[PDB]
């Protein structure tokens, strides 16, 4: 098949900036067919280019594909706030037709380190026979943070799961919860509960914990 | 050319079927050659789509049986015979009968339940306090605090699906830790499908 | 249209403790991470330390760690430096700054020079240089004074074109420095020249009219 | 830490040229590197932010550029006020990390000093000490000669000599000699001279006086 690789997985620029994403294929894609759809949260993907080069009625003057056969770019020569979303490529040459992973365009601001905190399950969901421990890292970007349970000092394994806001409004930070979750049964069983946060913006990793009682 | 699909969101017991339509504002048969310019596309939490069905009934490659688009002219369907926990996603339909392709807005598949909410305080050993909001179908819930006088230092974290086929979520705020003695914090959790409004006081 | 403003910066024993104060105005200060910077003698430039808005989050090189504390008070709107076991190394001017939230470091305080010497304060006797009997040049000597630094300005700060302000020079411990201004050679005596100096580590300052002999 | 290394160390160039300054990285830091200048008497000043985004009131002759761990600085028709030191630093990672710095200076043409000479002042006298002060002003090379004489004989002891840093309006430089004696010695010889050897005369510039007129 075609395989279309985007480049990068998320690119950071300011409103006004103008922002390059790449779709490079792995075999030549014929007669230039290749497409770049736009994606808005919670809306239908649209098509925004088309032939490599051309730009789809309805579609503004910013927006310019360029390339051919393996090398493809589109450029939004001057950002609005609102084109800060998720960018697909798709080729239509040559079957089975198969999607870039994307590229998604963020808000570039400096680079903040988390404020940790951790909270034990409350007595009336212990009562209920289930414990969700959750771990909340605040006003932090980038958004790359690896969070790491560990119970008893044993680092857990896919028995937790990480939501992530939207990026902020006002300071355009991410603030991250991760809640591990065991029955009563299970969580009665071990002592000191531990999410230990690494981040870029720390020199070093930040542990938070407490021993049940 | 526009395209509506209904219904919006379905609910299915495992392994049942599953029927979604999708109307076109005007006919995408091609009298010359007797084609329908309609596709189908799948789509997952994060990631991009995946072509199911093309040419209104033509399965793309390594498109598993179950999954069957019909009709022609302005009405079309897709169908999935056996639905199983894997078919959970987003569904589209496009037409590419006019150089300027476009989707319908799209339909949410899902399995069948139907419960209200469980609220419990998020409260630990500036301080941090919250409500963790579990085991609720089908969404959407809304959470505001002290019936939104409190908003600043707010995050309302988006919904997960679990196990169970039930959706949780976490909302937390950041107040002064001097506070904790004297000022009121209540999570107000809204769940309009269970018709059912729950005001939970987190204490220190 | 904004001041940060550093005080406490002087002479301390080795082996003591210093608290550096910043007080910030002209922006929302509790919407802002808050960081220390300090440039030794040899001119390199050293970050030390940083907090976010709720100071439940600290940014502190290793090196330090363990041996300053940051902090601030978000109402009085200042922001603090403890160090302890006070040493050699930390001989240098420290910064306070923003930390800018679309924008790195976009505001420095001027900079306040911290001296550790058991050294005693001392204020400096000033003398004015003037001639023997198209433009002249008067000056006067800044001697004896510790620590570093003091201010000179001339004629209140209203004569800055023509003016140079010599490096000082230490000698038996304590500093001497001189300053030097030219204006036309009508201008002076029929005109009178004064050099203003504050010495903020001894709360003095001295204002020497140039007198003709 | 991460290691930022800039080259050269320092660079000499004439008013109108180009300088480019490149920074080095000890591993990928994207975008967050970002370039100080610091003037002489002052604190360092944003100019360049995220590798190439001017920060507000520079100058448009100054640009940046780079990405992964790879950067430059370039001021095109360089100029006096310009006069500075320059520092990259990278905020992607902890600990935030400065370069080694580049100090630039500004090639022009020679000028010969502005010598003036001053006997020590009644106030210093009074007190029981006596300075010869000789100011040098506004010359260039910086490379420059003085040399003390009392009654036609060298001098050597209680000279004490500073140079001002090269002079953000013209691109000159400034040197103060200060002759420190015993009110003794001062009163025991009568003539007192400054002699100035530098590469604009063969013939050394001399100012003098004599104590008892
Ligand atoms: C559904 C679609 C899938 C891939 C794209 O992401 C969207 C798409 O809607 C574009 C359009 C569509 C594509 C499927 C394949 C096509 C029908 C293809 C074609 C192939 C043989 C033929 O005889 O006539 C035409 C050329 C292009 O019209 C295609
Ligand atoms: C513009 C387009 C029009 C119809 C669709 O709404 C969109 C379309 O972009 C899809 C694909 C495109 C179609 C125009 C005609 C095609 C190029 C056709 C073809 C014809 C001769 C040939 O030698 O090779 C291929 C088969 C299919 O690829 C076609």
């Known amino acids: 098949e075609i395989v279309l690789t985007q480049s990068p997985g998320t690119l950071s620029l300011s409103p006004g900036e103008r922002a390059t994403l790449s779709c490079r294929a792995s075999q030549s894609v014929g007669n230039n067919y290749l497409a770049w759809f736009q994606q808005k949260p919670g809306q239908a993907p649209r098509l925004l280019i088309y032939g490599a080069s051309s730009r789809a009625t309805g579609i503004p003057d910013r927006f310019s594909g360029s390339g051919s056969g393996t090398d493809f770019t589109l450029t939004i020569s001057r950002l609005e706030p609102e084109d800060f979303v998720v960018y697909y490529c798709q080729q239509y040459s040559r079957s089975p037709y198969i999607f870039g992973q994307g590229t998604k365009l963020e808000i570039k601001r400096t680079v903040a380190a988390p404020s940790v905190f951790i909270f034990p399950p409350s007595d009336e969901q212990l009562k209920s026979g289930t414990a969700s421990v959750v771990c909340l890292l605040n006003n932090f970007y980038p958004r790359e943070a690896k969070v790491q349970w560990k119970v008893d000092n044993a680092l857990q394994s896919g028995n937790s799961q990480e939501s992530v806001t939207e990026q902020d409004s006002k300071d355009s930070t991410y603030s991250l919860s991760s809640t591990l979750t065991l029955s009563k049964a299970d969580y009665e069983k071990h002592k000191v509960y531990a999410c230990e946060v690494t981040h870029q913006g720390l020199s070093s990793p930040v542990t938070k914990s407490f021993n049940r009682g | 050319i526009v395209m509506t699909q209904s219904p919006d969101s379905l609910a299915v017991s495992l392994g049942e079927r599953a029927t979604i339509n999708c109307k076109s504002s005007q006919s995408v048969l091609y009298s010359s050659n007797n084609k329908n310019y309609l596709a189908w596309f799948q789509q997952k939490p994060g990631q991009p789509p995946k072509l199911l069905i093309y040419w209104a009934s033509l399965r793309e490659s390594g498109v598993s049986d179950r999954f069957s688009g019909s009709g022609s002219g302005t009405d079309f369907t897709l169908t999935i015979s056996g639905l199983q926990a894997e078919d959970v996603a987003v569904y589209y339909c496009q037409q590419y009968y006019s150089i300027l392709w476009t989707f319908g807005q799209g339909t949410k598949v899902e399995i069948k339940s139907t419960k209200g909410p469980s609220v419990f305080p998020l409260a630990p050993c500036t301080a941090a306090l919250g409500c963790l909001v579990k085991d609720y179908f089908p969404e959407p819930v809304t959470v505001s605090w002290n019936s939104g006088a409190l908003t600043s230092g707010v995050h309302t974290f988006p919904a997960v699906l679990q196990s169970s086929g039930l959706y949780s979520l976490s909302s937390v705020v950041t107040v002064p830790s001097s506070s904790l003695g004297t000022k009121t914090y209540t999570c107000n959790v809204d769940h309009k499908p269970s018709n059912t409004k729950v005001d939970k006081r987190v204490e220190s | 249209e904004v001041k940060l403003l550093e005080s406490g910066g002087g002479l301390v024993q080795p082996g003591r403790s210093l608290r550096l104060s910043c007080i910030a105005s002209?922006?929302?200060?509790?919407?802002?991470?808050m960081t220390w910077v300090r440039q030794a003698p040899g001119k390199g430039l050293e970050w030390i330390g940083d907090?976010?808005?709720?100071?439940?989050?600290?940014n502190s090189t290793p090196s330090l760690k363990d041996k300053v504390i940051i902090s601030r008070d978000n109402a009085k709107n200042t922001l603090f430096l403890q160090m302890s076991k006070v040493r050699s190394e930390d001989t240098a001017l420290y910064y306070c700054?923003?930390?800018?939230?679309?924008?790195?470091?976009?505001?420095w305080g001027q900079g306040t020079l911290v001296t550790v010497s058991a050294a005693k304060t001392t204020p400096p006797s000033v003398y004015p240089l003037a001639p023997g009997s198209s433009m002249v040049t008067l000056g006067c000597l800044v001697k004896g004074y510790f620590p570093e630094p003091v201010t000179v300005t001339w004629n209140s700060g209203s004569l800055s074109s023509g003016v140079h302000t010599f490096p000082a020079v230490l000698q038996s411990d304590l500093y001497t420095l001189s300053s030097s201004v030219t204006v036309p050679s009508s201008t002076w005596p029929s005109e009178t020249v004064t050099c203003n100096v504050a010495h903020p580590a001894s709360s003095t300052k001295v204002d020497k009219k140039i007198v003709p002999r | 830490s991460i290691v930022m290394t800039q080259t050269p160390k320092f660079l000499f160039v004439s008013a109108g040229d180009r300088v480019t300054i490149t920074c080095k990285a000890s591993?990928?830091?994207?975008?967050?590197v970002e370039w100080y200048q610091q003037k002489p008497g002052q604190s360092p000043k944003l100019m360049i932010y995220?590798?190439?985004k001017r920060y507000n009131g520079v100058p448009d002759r100054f640009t940046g550029s780079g990405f992964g761990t790879e950067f430059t600085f370039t001021i095109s028709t360089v100029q006096a006020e310009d006069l500075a030191v320059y520092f990259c630093?990278?905020?992607?990672?902890?600990?935030?990390?400065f370069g080694g710095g580049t100090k630039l200076e500004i090639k022009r043409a020679d000028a010969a000093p502005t010598v003036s000479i001053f006997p020590p002042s009644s106030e210093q006298l009074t007190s029981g000490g006596a300075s010869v002060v000789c100011f040098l002003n506004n010359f260039y090379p910086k490379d420059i000669n003085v040399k003390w004489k009392i009654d036609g004989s060298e001098r050597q002891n209680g000279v004490l000599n500073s140079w001002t840093d090269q002079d953000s309006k013209d691109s000159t430089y400034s040197m103060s000699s200060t002759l420190t004696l015993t009110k003794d010695e001062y009163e025991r010889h009568n003539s007192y001279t400054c002699e100035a050897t530098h590469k604009t005369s063969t013939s050394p510039i001399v100012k003098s006086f004599n104590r008892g007129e």
């Open positions: 630093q990278q905020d992607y990672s902890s600990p935030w990390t």
């Open positions: 002209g922006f929302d200060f509790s919407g802002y991470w």
């Open positions: 995220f590798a190439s």
């Open positions: 700054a923003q930390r800018g939230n679309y924008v790195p470091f976009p505001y």
């Open positions: 907090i976010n808005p709720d100071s439940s989050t600290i």
């Open positions: 591993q990928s830091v994207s975008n967050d």
